[PDB]
Amino acid sequence: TEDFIKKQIEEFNIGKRHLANMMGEDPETFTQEDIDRAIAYLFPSGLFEKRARPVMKHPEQIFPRQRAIQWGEDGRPFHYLFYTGKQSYYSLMHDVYGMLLNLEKHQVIGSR
Amino acid sequence: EDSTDFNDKILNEPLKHSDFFNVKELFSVRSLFDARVHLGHKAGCRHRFMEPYIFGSRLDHDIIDLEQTATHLQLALNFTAHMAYRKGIILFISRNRQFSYLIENMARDCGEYAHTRYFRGGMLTNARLLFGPTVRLPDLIIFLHTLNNIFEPHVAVRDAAKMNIPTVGIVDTNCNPCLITYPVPGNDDSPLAVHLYCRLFQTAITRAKEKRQQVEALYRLQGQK
Amino acid sequence: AGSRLETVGSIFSRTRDLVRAGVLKEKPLWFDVYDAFPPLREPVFQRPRVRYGKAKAPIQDIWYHEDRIRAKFYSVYGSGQRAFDLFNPNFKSTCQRFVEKYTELQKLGETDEEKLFVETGKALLAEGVILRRVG
Amino acid sequence: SNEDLPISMENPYKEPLKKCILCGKH
Amino acid sequence: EDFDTRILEVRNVFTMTAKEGRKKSIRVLVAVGNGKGAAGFSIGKATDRMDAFRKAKNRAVHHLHYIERYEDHTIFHDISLRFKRTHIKMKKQPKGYGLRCHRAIITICRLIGIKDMYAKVSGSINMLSLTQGLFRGLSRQETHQQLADKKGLHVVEIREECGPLPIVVASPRGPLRKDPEPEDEVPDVKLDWEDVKTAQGMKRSVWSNLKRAAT
Amino acid sequence: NVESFASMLRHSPLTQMGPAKDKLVIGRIFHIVENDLYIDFGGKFHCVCRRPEVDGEKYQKGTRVRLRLLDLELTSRFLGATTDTTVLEANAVLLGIQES
Ligand code: FES
Ligand SMILES: [Mg+2]
C-alpha cells in the first residue's frame, strides 16, 4: 500500500545514510551508483542473473510501478479511463489521437 | 451528532425539490430539434419496443417524438445531477468510434469516467477479480450509444442490470430500451445530437458537483456557529 | 450482495425486495434518487416478440396537405438548380415557395387544384423564380 | 387538436409502377 | 450466516473427451435461503463434489429471488404453471396445514420460509426444471396489495373460522373505485380436473392424504 | 407561446425536401481519409464520396459541395434477417464544389 511505500522510502533513506557511514563517505552526496558499488563489495555474488544479486535500490524501483489501489479512501479511481482495465495504454492512445487531430488542424536510421 | 444533521441537510435536501439543479434550463424542444435529435433509422430497422417513442414515419424514416424526449431527458439529467451531487461514480459508455475521443475528453473534463473501447467480458460482473475486491463499481452508467458495432445491444446494459447499476441511455429507433433504467429516445448518429448530449450531461454533472461543494461549504460554515 | 436476475423485475424492485429481506444491509446510493424521481416506465426486461397476423405497428406516416402540392411540383419541375441548404433552419426551397404561393391563392377562395397550380406557377414566374420543366 | 398534426392519406410522392412494355397492349 | 444451503440433486456427468475418453464430473444443484422470503438456486459443475458445492452455493447466493409470502407463512394465491414439461400446481393453505409438496419443493419452501402449502407435480419431474419453474411461479405471484392497487378496490378476506366478519387485507393507495366490479354469475376460469374430482369426492386414491411425518 | 414539436417538424427543411431521391443538397466535408470525403448534409447520416480526379486537392475540411441524394439511409433486408441491415451512411453523388 501507499503507507507501506512511504515506510519503505524512510527505511531506504536510513539505510542509505548507514551505508554511507559504513563506506566512510558523505551521506549527502552518496549517489545510487555508490550504493550499488558498496552493496556489490559488501555482498559479493557470482550469480549470473543480475536481478538475483543483492540490491538496495530506491523503493520506487524495487517495488513494481503498478502502485497500490488506484483509488482513494472514497473509492473513486484517480484516472478517468480506469474502468477500461488498461488506463495507461488507452490514455496513451487518446493522447496520440489528440496529437493526430491537432496535426490535422495545423495542416529510421539510428532508432527502432 | 454531526451525521444526524449532515445526512439530512445535504443528501436529503435536493430530494424534496422536483428540479433541484434546474436541468430544464439546459435543453429545449427547439434546441433538440436543431440538434437533429428527432431523426431515426428507417422503418425496417425499427425496434418494436421503441414504437411508443416514435412520433411517426416520414417517408419510411422514423421520427422520434421530441415531446416524450424532453420529459425523458429531463428525468435522466435530473437523475445524473442527483448522482453526481452524491459523489457517485458516473461512467459513460459508447462503442461508436466516431465519438470515442469526444466522449473520453468530456468525461475527463467533467471529472467522471469513460469506457469507449472494447468492453472486456466481465468488466462489471467480474470486477472484483479484475480489479481487486475493494473496487467500487460505478453508481450510474450513461450510454450515449446502446448498440455495439455488430448492432446488438451493448453487453454493458445487461451487465449493469445484473449488478443493479442504473443506466441512463440514448436509445435510437433501432435500440432496445427494455433494460435501460432511464431511456432517452433520440438520434445517436448525428454529430450534432451527440455533441448536444455530451454538453447537457457535462453541464448537469458540473452543476451538480458545484452545488454539492457550495452546500457542503454552507453547512460546514453554519454548523460551526 | 445483490440479485443478478436481470430477467426478474427491475433493479429497483430487486434492490427494494432484498433490502426488505435484510440481505442488503444498506441501500445503494442511487436508491433514494430512483425513489424520489422514478422513470416513466419501470425497467423490466421484456422479450421483443415478433408480430404475426393482423397485428400491425401503430406508427403513422407523416403526411400534410402541402404534400400533394409538393409531389405535383416535383413531378412537373423536379429539383431546381437551387440546392437544399438543410443546415439553415430558416431555409425556404423553391418547392416551399410554390407551396406558400399556392396556400395564399387558396386563401383567396380558389379551389381548382389543377388551375391553382398554373396560377401559382404564373405568379412565381412573374416573381422571376426559375421554373424549368422536367420535360 | 392542432392543424400541424399529420393527416392520413395515400403517399402523394408514390411514383407509378414500372409497367411492362406490353402492358395495356393487345 | 442467516442463509442455509440445501442440496437438491447431485449427478455424475460423464463427458467424452478426445484423449481421456470418459471423464467424470459432478453437477450439483443447490438452493440457498434465509427463511425470510429471500432464496435462490444455482448449478455447479466441478471435478470434485466439494468444489461443486462451494461453486453452486456461492453462485446461488448472488441469484436470490424474493418470494412474497402471505402472512409470512404461505403463498398469496393458487398457482398453476408449466415450465418446459413440468406442471406445478401450488395451493395456498391455512396455518397448520404444513407442507404437502414434493420433497424438493418442501426443501425450497423451508429455505424460503413457507410453512403451509400444497403442491402437485405432474409431467417430467426433472429436478432443475421443477426447481426453476417453482421459483418462477413463486416470484411472479401477485400480492393482495398489488391486486388492490391494480383494480382500485378493497381486497376483503372472508374466513369461515371468523364467520361473516369482513377482513380488509389490502386497500388501494390511490383513488378507490366507485363502480362495483361486475358480478358474472358464471366465472370464466380454467379449472383442474383433479381439483374438481377431489372436491366432488370421486378422487379415490390409496395414496392421497396418507399420514406422513411432520413437515 | 412556444412553437410545438409538430410545427417544427412540419416546417423543417428536411420535411419540405420530400423524398430524398435525386434531390440537390449542399453538404460540408467534415472529414477526409485519403481520397474519401465524409460529407454531412443535414441528414441523420453522412455520406462517403471519392475525391474527384479533377480539382481533388481543392476539397478540404469545411469545403461546401453539391450532392445529389439517392437515399438518406442505406438499408437492406437479407434472407432470414428479421430486421433491416444498415451501413449507417447515406448514398449521394458528389457533383462538385459549391461557390457562394
Ligand atoms: S406490367 Fe402490367 S400488364 Fe405487364
Ligand atoms: Mg442510431
mmCIF file of C-alpha atoms in Angstrom, chain A residues 69 71 74-86 90 93-95 97-98 101, chain B residues 87-89 91 101 104-105 108 111-115 117 123 131 134-138 209:
data_model
loop_
_atom_site.group_PDB
_atom_site.id
_atom_site.type_symbol
_atom_site.label_atom_id
_atom_site.label_comp_id
_atom_site.label_asym_id
_atom_site.label_seq_id
_atom_site.Cartn_x
_atom_site.Cartn_y
_atom_site.Cartn_z
ATOM 1 C CA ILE A 69 -5.028 0.554 -5.301
ATOM 2 C CA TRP A 71 -8.500 4.824 -5.814
ATOM 3 C CA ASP A 74 -13.678 7.244 -1.019
ATOM 4 C CA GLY A 75 -13.068 4.566 -3.659
ATOM 5 C CA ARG A 76 -13.134 6.959 -6.610
ATOM 6 C CA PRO A 77 -10.417 5.946 -9.101
ATOM 7 C CA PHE A 78 -7.827 8.586 -9.909
ATOM 8 C CA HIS A 79 -7.723 8.015 -13.677
ATOM 9 C CA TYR A 80 -10.789 8.629 -15.819
ATOM 10 C CA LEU A 81 -10.013 5.614 -18.035
ATOM 11 C CA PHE A 82 -9.615 3.257 -15.072
ATOM 12 C CA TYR A 83 -12.616 1.095 -15.929
ATOM 13 C CA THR A 84 -11.030 0.235 -19.276
ATOM 14 C CA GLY A 85 -8.672 -2.012 -17.296
ATOM 15 C CA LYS A 86 -5.813 -0.614 -19.419
ATOM 16 C CA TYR A 90 -5.748 3.780 -23.567
ATOM 17 C CA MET A 93 -3.738 6.098 -27.324
ATOM 18 C CA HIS A 94 -6.063 9.000 -26.513
ATOM 19 C CA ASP A 95 -3.122 11.402 -26.299
ATOM 20 C CA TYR A 97 -5.120 10.541 -31.239
ATOM 21 C CA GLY A 98 -5.363 14.079 -29.897
ATOM 22 C CA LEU A 101 -6.197 15.644 -34.571
ATOM 23 C CA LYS B 87 -20.406 11.932 -5.483
ATOM 24 C CA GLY B 88 -21.367 8.706 -7.223
ATOM 25 C CA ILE B 89 -19.170 7.298 -9.964
ATOM 26 C CA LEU B 91 -19.308 6.003 -16.356
ATOM 27 C CA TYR B 101 -12.351 10.850 -28.427
ATOM 28 C CA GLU B 104 -13.500 10.413 -23.327
ATOM 29 C CA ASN B 105 -12.490 14.078 -23.314
ATOM 30 C CA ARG B 108 -12.246 13.592 -18.208
ATOM 31 C CA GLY B 111 -14.446 14.560 -13.533
ATOM 32 C CA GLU B 112 -16.243 11.321 -14.412
ATOM 33 C CA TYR B 113 -15.126 8.199 -16.218
ATOM 34 C CA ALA B 114 -15.347 6.823 -19.748
ATOM 35 C CA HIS B 115 -15.178 3.395 -21.403
ATOM 36 C CA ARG B 117 -13.055 0.721 -26.003
ATOM 37 C CA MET B 123 -15.654 -5.790 -16.549
ATOM 38 C CA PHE B 131 -9.675 -5.020 -10.023
ATOM 39 C CA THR B 134 -12.112 -3.359 -2.821
ATOM 40 C CA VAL B 135 -13.039 -1.828 -6.191
ATOM 41 C CA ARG B 136 -16.093 0.447 -6.249
ATOM 42 C CA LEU B 137 -18.444 -0.152 -9.161
ATOM 43 C CA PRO B 138 -19.993 2.849 -10.932
ATOM 44 C CA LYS B 209 -20.692 18.997 -8.278
#
